[model samples]
Target: PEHYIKHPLQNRWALWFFKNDKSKTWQANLRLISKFDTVEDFWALYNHIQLSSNLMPGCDYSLFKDGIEPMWEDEKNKRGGRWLITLNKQQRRSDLDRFWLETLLCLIGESFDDYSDDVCGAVVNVRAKGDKIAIWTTECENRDAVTHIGRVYKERLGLPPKIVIGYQSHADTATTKNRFVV
Candidate 1:
């Protein structure tokens, strides 16, 4: 109780929530939930928020630096890429939530070290087919930064030795073996 000071983060983060709503437009379906800049405040909001695993199918939670929109159209994100983690249905029940929490910590804790400045944010998509968690970064062609970021992220996620995660450029429609894997 004596340590009452709140540790400030390098950047303020915003949490956005999205739900499937055919009756509404995509932008309307997504809403800003909250923003926090201090370690204490982040935990305060995190402990009170709903679990990613508990979210309904088609729902999404995006944690991005304040002022950066999660959409690819955002100027800050247009040329960026994401390091993605896909989860099977079985892992959704056991590892989804943990992986999500770890991802958040990696972001807020700046686990990417030297390349942390290149990080834009992270997103978790809760889908019926499979769940996905991705860490978004700026500069799709910055191979040095991209590969290093991916390696740090995979280690922080505590993935197995053989289990691999990949990085893909936003310009690409999706993933491919040609991309960086760590």
Candidate 2:
């Protein structure tokens, strides 16, 4: 489609940035960068920023539905869980960009079939130890939907079957055991 005939997405998404500035409070360091609901605008925003691999350790990029905050405390996220993927240091350079890009595509493309409604958003954490990316969903107890989302997500990322990912509810994330693993 032409720039003037851009395709509209199913949901409006807000991009958030978290710069770990010790001098500032966690809330202070977090900010909403922009919102976009069109394919053209998405590319523009994506191309204008540093890739996830280029972010400083402790920094993060989050893409969430327009009304939702990317925090466990948020009502939309309180009962939700995330499908987590921890990447090794070397994979950060080799797979981080591709993984994160595919994540965004999945959300914006609403590629989760019937379970798309269960999706909340996704986050990319740039850390020194290793990088992490997660897709957050609205329900933790909905086993079937959660597993379906995880399976499709893993397949779409082209991850090897041996590389298993885990889904942890925010409730469990605060404690020891994860809610589910697929």
Candidate 3:
């Protein structure tokens, strides 16, 4: 019998999780789950983990390229930002898992093409207000790359054209008193 093999991704990425703990500092709440450079390994981990919808409020799941921590302080993400998707409470049951899965596939499949290099990572924050998902790009000022990533990401997630999303810089999101919208 022949064995099937999955192709390798262009770059290795690390999965991160932030469990909201009142006693812990923000940095202490973030953790590195695993890193993978191959499609098989990515799926292996994905299949084993809990979906975003299953996470408790105040938690987050992030996937970033190796060496690039998911936090805004990371050198690669310091000047970057994210394209935020605020889902309605009802969409959590229908869209959260699917969207997050698509995110993982995007990373493992190198879906960004030439602009993949500028892609920092993705994050899903399960908030009490509402669940939010964002794709973190390497540079917010790199309009070409940032816009290209946003366009592709919007389409890949099967979002409706009328459903608008916003992009906010980490300098804006991380330092501001609250999450800013742009």
Candidate 4:
């Protein structure tokens, strides 16, 4: 451990957890796990936590900027949108973990260049029907930033070019309609 050195991320990000509860309000279920301003700490936490695949159905893990809450109600998220990557049921055993890990890496690594500031956070929802991973950004109108983030995000996930992911504004997703595309 003498040689252990911690690397730092450009931004400090807070991790949030949500578990669907019939007895509790959605807002109550959302809780901050911790914040990491360094790469080593991020990895330390990552390694310590259970894999997303291990999460029970109706649970979620979100990593967002320090002050932003992981909800559409947050001011930073109200005008924002998410680039959703849906995972098939079977992929949960194979691809889900890897995809989510890579997504987190992208966020903490600040892989989005100048547009990185637009990234509010990322979330992974574990459901029996279908798992979802989304990168939530700050503004829905910034098409250039949003699209660029999607393209790079999809690329970083190593998804095939033919597999298109959608970037949906909170407005559209809020309606529970599928009217979003990057």
User: Which numbered prediction scores highest in lDDT against the true structure?
Assistant: 2
Model 3, which residues run further than 4 Å from truth?
1-6, 176-182
Q: Whose TM-score is greatest here?
A: 2
Candidates by TM-score, descending order: 2, 1, 4, 3
Candidates in order have lDDT scores of 0.89, 0.93, 0.84, 0.90
Worst 10 residues of 4 by lDDT: 173-182
Error of 3 at 3 (Å): 4.5
Residue range 86-117, candidate 4, lDDT tens digits: 99999999899999999999998889989999
Candidate 3 per-residue lDDT over residues 45-140, each given as its tens digit? 988998899899999999998999998888899988888888878989999889988877886677888998888888999887789888888787
Model 1 residue 53 lDDT score: 88
**What is the C-alpha lDDT profile of model 1 across 1-182, one tens digit per residue?**
54787899988999999999999999899899999999999999999988988998999999999999987878878898899999998888998999999999998998887899899999999999999999999888889999999888888888888998888777774325427888
TM-scores, all candidates, are 0.94, 0.95, 0.91, 0.94
Candidate 2, run of 10 with poorest lDDT: 173-182
**Candidate 1 structure lDDT:** 0.89
Off by over 4 Å in 1: 174-178
In candidate 3 the C-alpha lDDT for residue 85 amounts to: 82
Better of 1 and 3 by lDDT: 1
